[PDB]
Design a protein around this ligand. Structure first.
Ligand SMILES: Cc1ncc(C[n+]2csc(CCOP(=O)(O)O)c2C)c(N)n1
Ligand SMILES: Cc1ncc(C[n+]2csc(CCOP(=O)(O)O)c2C)c(N)n1
Ligand SMILES: Cc1ncc(C[n+]2csc(CCOP(=O)(O)O)c2C)c(N)n1
Ligand SMILES: [Mg+2]
Ligand SMILES: [Mg+2]
Ligand SMILES: [Mg+2]
Lengths: 511, 507, 507
């Protein structure tokens, strides 16, 4: 018999009998997992005879208690009472929490499956001793649950309602579609806005239970869960609070010129050509492939980068493949969501759950939207985006605000961030007096050439300066919309062919 | 809150959500049912969200409690404790009973789906306050999720273990077309216990007129007479007199009975002769469609063999057609082997027989086991199937288990056990399915005011009597057979039973 | 490299690659069998790349040449010349025989698939050095790609043509449940020829244990006793004495045999009566599941008619069932027309009969064709189907063709031909399925030490004697029939054969 505060939600294993690899037992699997982590166990029988249920449940509570880890049951309250369970997990369509508590009395843990912030509101109007831990939504598509309606974005919305309502007593785990190919990302971008709360643990089912080798699969998840660095891009992620110096900007450009980045553009037909020209100017080769099979070979090429629009004709099933393919080799993705309308809203949020981006670029509307909402306003909104999607965010306008919410690639369980909140991540401005997707292309090239020892922040900033600089130079040499565009590409070339950033007009202050 | 002894098991309604006619509600049906009986209610949700379960079970608990009838839950104990239910019913593959008792404490009614005697044994090894009532087996084929004989074996285990505390209900396929029969033969062998109640589902829930279906079952449930055959069933203990035997034969001769023979090929011919001899007409139809029209003809009678070639589906048909027009069926299970055991035990659950006729071996098999021994088995068969049971041999024993056609809930029989039903004997000194045909004809010609038992005995005399005559006038197996038919013809054509050789004593 | 004469056709294995149980190799089986018999191997690939074929016919020619056993290829000649094979087997739809003998030249073995006599004619007018051996038709239904009668016709042509250079193996559905019967009744009509060996497979290759399967098949082949009926099979040339006929009748009254009749409607009734008279119990089952249960009962006997309405699949069930337990079967083909001719020949390949009964017509067809004529046919039938055979007329002829249940490879009998089996006659002057029932009862009664032949005769005498007696005490067709049954009753209730009118002489 344990006590609420003894429950280690680190690596929470949930079982499913009908999914076991031929030649193995539910016990065998659930065992090899206790020898390598699986620090908590839920028994799940959605179909078996409520007797065979009790038999298998008793059989596993001996193995469990043996390794000193609790057993939880789902979602049969009676079976829990019957066999001396340590806790029960119930869903939103199962017996109400108040009724359960009256039958079981305080001291027994209660899980509740929560997917929306509106459900955290009810969990709170019940006070402590009611709910003890929630399993958050269904983060990713899974083939385990056979029947209602997520991503990290959705889980943030819930961790945030756990704070607004100050439900200190209630822990959290993330569950569903969780595998080694996205655990770090999930752990990494699942923090409350104020940086105070994160997931206390991770849930798996088809990852150990369905495994031809549960011993290894469990040891692997352990590896990731209590690591603390998500090095998602092969650049430096160090937090730099010092403004970007002329010497820094100059060395960024020599690298991007000397390493001829290959920048794959997945974007609309109107930027296709233009964007290719900005790339050619910046001394790098552009490829416009939306071909799924190619994607992994393309991203294999040295110093490759992915710049990425919405409204592209490519099927989401290819974006998901491309995005992943770049993250697997740890190369930079520059995201730019042009949206706004109901369809694009959906598409953009689906994309944001496919992987981890090194930069998210947008204008006023697209940024205020992404933050889930002046000048003091844009700044606060750029920082929210930056933090939320753990990325360098750029907000374009008369002023350009950059913000670094990468936080050196740190995650931890529950902690959650090191007191580092939305409000105080580095954010800098760039302006050059009154005067599109071409920036994305520029940003893309600067990050692209950076070496192991580079820095992702100074890169994204150098880019904004280079562009705003060509921006000022063109607007003076031009005759109208037509020639402005071709003198912009001209300026971008001359400027980076002579690395004299001590010359360019944009002024770089603190925001 | 009720007490265990406040539970009325009469008409016990189990609910099913996905079976209600379009335009109607689970509240709707279960309301009209309470108004005309439905003296107990179980909610059953094998599929629904365990919340909508709670919701829908609170809403029906107000309805039930208002007509003052309990509410039982199958088979989630949690849902039961949760909503303060009155009882819970659990099946064999559900939560062990000791565990349930431990979570609900004594005072809650527990139900246990029992279909085999061996499980009544575990129910007793637990003592009272454990299992409080049981649902017996699956009596008949049903499409929502043994026979009456399979239930009796249970009601018998409840007696040998003296588990007085345990009530019973019958369940599975129960409808107006067999309720009265279930009730009528579902009694313990010592006659002291019967079913406390009848349990339905598809019969009220799935009714386009719930109100009306409930009023019909109540109709049958608390009546007490199964007039299953248009003949008198009075219990006569006065040996059949010579004037009685006489009158029987006059009636069978004056109404020219029509006897349907569903038998093998070997008896076909010989059986029709014996019928003809008796002044009546045989029909050897084994055609399903014809069956209703046939049995509607005046004084129709069905004689029935096993090992006939006709399919079970049609035998089911026939037996039914004849019990519907309240006419007499005479059963004769020749068998013994695995196939014939299975086939007969299926036929015996298709309807009610007016007389089962076997020889020594057949009789011991049916009775589920000398001369004192034959007598016991012949009673056992007679009481077990509530019928007149004949047993052939040097001595023929006739036993009357019709008990005037009386049933009742839990009573069960007026204490009238296997041991004390009328059993007589017939014998005519040392000397088959022809007996079937004789008996058949005799019962056939009986008028509303007649008597079944006396008629079956008349048959066994007449036959035994024509027997001695033949054996005296024959040159061998060959001519014995024609003369047996002749003597039957000469005997019935002169009603002087005071002349006949066979002596009829008590057993 | 072998010679034509070093070919041991005893156990002839024929591979099939796609039928080996998961976990086993064609090498593993073909090896496993070599160590327990498998005295000649053929390689059969009707589907694989003619390369892989080649590799596998080499790998397996080592394994074979090592156990000193040849290797035959079918039906690709090239592959046989190519890997230095010992012989080629070709069918009817394959390369003509002349062409082959030119490309491979003498000293190599050529086996032909023959299944009709005509094909033996072709095979004769080609002389020796052409066809060496021949696999005979398909004997029984098989799933891998006539009966033992079809085989006989072929083994006859091989003699009428005098193809002394030609061996024979039987093939097609050969399994433990039917190998001895095949080995036993598959001899020449002149008794000088029989099968030189037996072709599997799907019995060794398909086997979950190829070693055991091959040991068994060995057991059967070089044994020389087919005990198919648990009764004496001794040849007796001593006319059946009065004492024996009397003993015969006591044994059968005392043992009350159970005679299962499978027959039409018109012999049902009459049939049971005769059996009854003979003091034995008749069963009229045509029920498939009961059939194994029935034949387990003591002293059981199967009387089989044609034109019964029973499905062929069931008669197969039954005929096997009685052979499995070694109890007697009496066959009575009533036909004559295309459909009946078929059905009959088909039953005569389901199992081993103890007696075949027919009249002039029926007995003539079964022989495949006066008073000298009816004797030669009765002998032919008796010998062909290895059984006691009975031709009914004014004279009745009985012929013991069982030869003591003796079989041996190629030999094949012990010079006992169709012309010289014991055949006796029975007559009583000028005067059906009844005689079937009578015989079935007299054989049924016999104990381990009895004699099939004497019993068959006993029956014919009894039935004949009861004939003369009835013909006298009767007034017509009707009274004759009943009187006949009576006389059977009387005659057997007093075993005084010395009294009977029927005269028993040699034929
Ligand atoms: C602690 C807890 N939270 C939520 C639920 C409901 N739930 C959401 S998705 C899913 C399947 C995950 O398997 P996989 O890892 O194969 O995607 C489960 C069972 C629960 N039963 N327990
Ligand atoms: C009290 C009790 N005894 C047994 C059972 C199990 N069971 C046996 S038959 C069947 C279907 C009845 O509807 P129908 O009239 O269509 O046969 C049911 C539900 C139970 N749940 N409750
Ligand atoms: C010697 C010889 N005779 C005939 C043939 C043709 N053939 C007739 S039956 C059959 C398969 C029977 O196996 P089973 O019935 O045991 O499955 C085959 C292979 C041949 N290839 N060689
Ligand atoms: Mg649930
Ligand atoms: Mg149940
Ligand atoms: Mg061929």
């Amino acid at each position: 018999k344990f006590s609420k505060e003894q429950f280690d939600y680190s690596l929470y294993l949930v079982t499913d009998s009908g999914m076991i690899p031929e030649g193995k037992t539910l016990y065998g699997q659930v065992e090899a997992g206790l020898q390598n982590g699986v620090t908590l166990v839920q028994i799940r029988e959605k179909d078996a005879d409520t007797k065979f249920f009790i038999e298998e449940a008793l059989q596993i509570k001996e193995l469990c208690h043996a390794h000193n880890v609790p057993l939880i049951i789902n979602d049969r309250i009676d079976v829990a009472m019957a066999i001396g369970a340590d806790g029960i997990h119930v869903g939103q369509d199962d017996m109400p929490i108040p009724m359960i508590r009256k039958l079981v009395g305080p001291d027994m843990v209660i899980g509740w499956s929560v997917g929306f912030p509106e459900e955290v509101d009810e969990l709170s109007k019940m006070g402590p001793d009611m709910v003890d831990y929630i399993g958050v939504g269904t983060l990713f598509p899974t083939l385990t649950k056979k029947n209602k309606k997520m991503g990290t974005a959705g889980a943030i919305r819930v961790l945030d309602a756990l704070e607004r309502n100050n439900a200190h007593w209630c822990r959290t785990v993330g569950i569903g579609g969780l595998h080694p190919d996205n655990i770090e990302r999930v752990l990494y971008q699942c923090v409350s806005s104020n940086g105070k709360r994160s997931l206390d643990g991770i849930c798996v089912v088809s990852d150990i239970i369905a495994s031809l080798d549960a011993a290894k699969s469990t040891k692997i998840l352990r590896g990731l869960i209590d690591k603390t660095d998500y090095k998602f891009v092969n650049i430096g992620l160090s937090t730099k609070n010092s403004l970007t110096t002329t010497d820094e900007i100059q060395s960024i450009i020599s690298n991007t010129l000397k390493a001829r980045p290959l920048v794959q553009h997945i974007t609309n037909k109107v930027h296709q050509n233009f964007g290719a020209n900005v790339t050619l100017a910046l001394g790098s080769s552009p490829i416009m492939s939306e071909i799924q099979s190619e994607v992994n070979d393309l991203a294999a090429i040295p110093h490759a980068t992915l710049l990425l629009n919405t409204g592209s004709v490519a099927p989401p099933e290819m974006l998901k493949a491309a995005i992943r393919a770049y993250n697997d080799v740890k190369r930079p993705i520059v995201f730019d969501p042009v949206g706004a309308t109901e369809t694009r809203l959906l598409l953009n949020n689906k994309l944001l759950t496919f992987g981890q981006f090194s930069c998210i670029k947008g204008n006023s509307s697209e940024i205020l939207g992404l933050a889930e909402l002046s000048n003091e306003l844009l700044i606060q909104a750029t920082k929210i985006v930056a933090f939320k999607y753990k990325t360098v965010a750029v907000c374009t306008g008369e002023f350009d605000f950059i913000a670094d919410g990468t936080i050196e690639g740190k995650y931890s369980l529950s902690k959650g961030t090191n007191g580092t909140s939305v409000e105080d991540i580095p954010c800098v401005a760039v302006e050059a007096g009154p005067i599109g997707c071409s920036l994305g292309s520029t940003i893309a090239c600067m990050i692209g050439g950076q070496p192991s020892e580079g820095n992702l922040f100074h890169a994204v900033v150098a880019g904004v300066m280079l562009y705003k600089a060509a921006g000022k130079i063109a607007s003076e040499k031009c005759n109208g919309s037509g020639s402005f565009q071709v003198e912009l590409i001209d300026a971008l070339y001359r400027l980076t062919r002579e690395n004299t950033p001590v010359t360019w007009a944009p002024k770089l202050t603190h925001t």
